[PDB]
């Protein structure tokens, strides 16, 4: 490690780029850290800082960069020194060390400053906060001590700081438990949503936050959060319908809202009471012809089959274009039974091999779709097995889908595949072993 002592002495009498590298690999480092400090209290040097801080005993780091220093650095006019302080703070041990100072407060002050244009500083602060937010004392400093501030930034709805706040909440929600959840910061009232409409970028951002919020509730299994967010969901739908008073919503925000309604149709709730009401009063799936394809690609297929079976029956036909609809509509048995009569081996076999495989890979995903494939479209299975030139297929998508179809079927087991087991295994073997 004599390579680091050289750097320590070539500052007192390319190279940094090399230390930066020779450090991704792995005595007393204070002296070296002290110097980088002096230089900062006056770009590439930062990558060196971000490497050496983690690998050191934080007590050591804390001797050079004291709480008082960090504070001073953050209050300075020197961006690089601010980034460096962020790296130091990010590596706090224990993570709750600075939770009793105003360090977090200042991190937030800089974070929500519209005047800050340095995207590198913003992410550094966001990484610091993410890292430390596993600690409960850091969450207390954030959501208790700084709640009034966060809520005021929330109320600004000023473009630059609003985007940052939304990122902040999404990041933070990962670490929030039921008892710590505070509506006033994570949720928006009806009145705030109507207000965000005046600047459609803010509203669009708010729509995406909610989509992601519901997505995260579903992924993290935080269903206790639903009772807090679902009360304003009908508002997004009413605005989507109200083109007379709120034309900017359909005009600029149709797609982001469609994604939201996709999530709403999937919330763990008392049998679509919420979505059924939103659909009945506002969305009216089926009434606007230009939206039908999208509704059939996005909305819960079980909902679609119970409340809009006529649409599903009439509108869906097999083609390269309806593969989006196919992936969605077939993920519920009952909804699949509503499109079953639109398939035949002949209809599928007319498609170019790429789409055949996309269709087939889709049908191999579930028990009931596979059964139908084996029992009703064996000639399509024959096209899947092939003539003996599939190993010569150059298109990456085609190979990807075929292989995935082969895999999906094999995952079903020998007993359920009958006479197809051996040929499937054989074809899969040739695909992944090169033959």
């Amino acid at each position: 490690n004599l390579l680091t002592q050289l750097e320590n002495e070539l500052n007192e009498d390319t190279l940094l780029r090399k230390c930066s590298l020779n450090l991704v690999t792995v005595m007393d480092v204070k002296p070296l850290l002290a110097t980088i400090k002096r230089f900062l209290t006056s770009d590439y040097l930062l990558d060196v800082v971000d490497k050496l801080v983690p690998m050191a005993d934080f007590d050591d780091v804390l001797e050079v960069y004291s709480a008082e220093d960090l504070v001073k650095a953050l209050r300075s006019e020197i961006d690089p020194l601010k980034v460096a302080a962020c790296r130091v703070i990010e590596n706090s041990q224990p993570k709750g060390l600075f939770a009793t100072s105003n360090i977090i407060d200042i991190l937030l002050d800089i974070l929500f400053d519209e005047k800050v244009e340095n995207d590198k500083l913003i992410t550094a602060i966001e990484k610091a906060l993410e890292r430390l937010s596993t600690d409960e004392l850091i969450r207390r400093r954030l959501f208790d001590n700084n709640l009034p501030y966060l809520v005021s930034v929330k109320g600004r709805m000023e473009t630059v700081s609003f985007v940052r706040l939304i990122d902040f909440l999404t990041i933070e929600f990962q670490f929030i438990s039921g008892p710590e959840f505070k509506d006033i910061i994570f949720c928006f009232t009806k009145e705030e949503i109507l207000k965000s409409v005046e600047d459609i970028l803010v509203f669009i951002e708010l729509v995406n936050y909610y989509t992601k919020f519901l997505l995260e509730i579903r992924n993290q299994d935080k269903y206790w959060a639903l009772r807090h967010v679902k009360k304003i969901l009908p508002v997004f739908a009413q605005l989507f319908e109200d083109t007379e008073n709120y034309p900017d919503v359909r005009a600029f925000s149709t797609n982001c809202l469609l994604q939201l309604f996709a999530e709403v149709s999937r919330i763990e709730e008392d049998e679509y009471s919420l979505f059924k009401t939103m659909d009945k009063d506002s969305l009216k799936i089926g009434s606007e012809a230009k939206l039908i394809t999208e509704w059939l690609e996005l909305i819960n297929p079980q909902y679609l089959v119970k409340y809009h079976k006529d649409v599903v029956e009439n509108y869906f036909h097999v083609s390269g274009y309806s593969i989006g609809m196919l992936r969605n509509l077939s993920a519920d048995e009952e909804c699949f039974n509503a499109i079953r009569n639109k398939f035949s081996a002949e209809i599928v076999l007319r498609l170019p091999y790429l789409e055949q495989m996309q269709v087939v890979e889709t049908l191999t995903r579930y028990e009931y779709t596979s059964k139908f494939l084996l029992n009703e479209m064996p000639k399509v299975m024959g096209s899947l097995i092939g003539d003996g030139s599939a190993g010569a297929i150059i298109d990456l998508e085609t190979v990807h889908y075929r292989n995935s179809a082969l895999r999906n079927l094999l995952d079903k087991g020998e007993e359920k595949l009958s006479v197809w087991y051996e040929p499937l295994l054989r074809e899969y073997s040739k695909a992944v072993n090169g033959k």
Side-chain angles (χ1 to χ4, degrees), residues 96 98-106 108 135-148 150 168:
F98 300 127
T100 44
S101 56
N102 55 346
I103 287 174
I104 300 322
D105 304 8
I106 302 176
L108 297 182
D135 185 52
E136 216 262 318
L137 304 189
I138 295 282
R139 295 196 307 273
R140 287 184 186 177
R141 189 72 194 194
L142 292 168
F143 302 104
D144 294 332
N145 305 70
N146 296 97
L147 189 59
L150 290 166
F168 171 83

Side-chain angles (χ1 to χ4, degrees), residues 29-30 33 52-63 93:
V29 307
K30 308 181 188 66
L33 286 176
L52 197 52
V53 166
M55 305 269 50
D57 180 354
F58 195 78
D59 264 324
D60 291 338
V61 182
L62 194 55
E63 185 84 14
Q93 288 291 147

